[PDB]
Amino acid sequence: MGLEVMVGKKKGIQGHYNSAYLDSTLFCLFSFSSVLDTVLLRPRSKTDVEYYKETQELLRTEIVNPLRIHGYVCATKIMKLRRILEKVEAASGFTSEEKDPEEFLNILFHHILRVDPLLRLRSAGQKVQDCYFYQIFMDKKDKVMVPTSQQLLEWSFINSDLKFAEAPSCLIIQMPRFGKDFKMFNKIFPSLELDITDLLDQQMELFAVLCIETSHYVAFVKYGSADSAWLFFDSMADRDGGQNGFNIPQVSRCPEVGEYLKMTPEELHALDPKNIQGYARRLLCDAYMCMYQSPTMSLY
């Protein structure tokens, strides 16, 4: 087992038929990280749903395993998962329709592998609230051109008075985006590490970013503590066959991402997207979800 396996064309989750909101998400959470592995392992309780075992089997052994071991997953297997998804919510259109990772994640986590909420948050010192991801919300004008996940998060935590009940193991943040037609910022500096000490009654590390310019999902993954340790994933990077055909996923190294995350925000603001080498453009411009975990890769 290793990394050389994971990289290249015909690697990662092969998408098919509006799958990217799923291929890319699954790739973020599982390809390299292990925050959520427990989910795949908790054995079957009485209390869980009828489908629970099957879901967990497909996920672990037909998806996550062969991802990590061979570096590839046929779309065949994704469609299965989709099917199950629909068995909860008939008229969801998980099998065909374009979806939001939030949608897909909620269904899966809450409804099938009922997973203890990843977050606990106390607004106004009032009752707690649980969820699986936080959406940044705030007011822009008085701010910078390119902020960081840190600032966003902080700023978002303020303006609706909130705080973490307890340290999360795994923190998924959605960028400030009003649909296809509205980014709040052209560029966002994803904080490599995240200090939440101020935001509970210490430290968290960035392990993947999920991107989308307007309508297609692709993913970046931190596989190492190293600056260069980044990969880019596109489930439908290429095709063979006509209308009758099949997609080919690809996974590519992109150290550049690292290099740019050593530059500053005011420095990246000055930069034109057409001058941002390699795949970095999409990370800095098309961030949808940033994903943090309690540190493992980090040294020191």
Binding site: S19, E98, D100, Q126, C131, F137, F178
Partner: protein, 76 residues
């Protein structure tokens, strides 16, 4: 009884509603003022995503409360 809904853009929109109303009933009203399918709408109160089945009284929303509105990002 009257509450505020804010988009990310900054725009506020006001609604005459009853504590009894459901979040679907509410997105119906939002849609009419802003032409956005409830499919896409994602309402938030106190940092919490609101389910379509529940009512406002249930999320302890009072008159003059402020909700945030956010869209989905369907892709694939």
């Amino acid at each position: 009884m009257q509450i505020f809904v804010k988009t990310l853009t900054g725009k506020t929109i006001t609604l005459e509603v009853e504590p009894s109303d459901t979040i679907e009933n509410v997105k119906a009203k939002i849609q009419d003022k802003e032409g956005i399918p409830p499919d896409q709408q994602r309402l938030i109160f106190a940092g919490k995503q609101l389910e379509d089945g529940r009512t406002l009284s249930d999320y302890n929303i009072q008159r003059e409360s402020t909700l945030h509105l956010v869209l989905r990002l369907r892709g694939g």
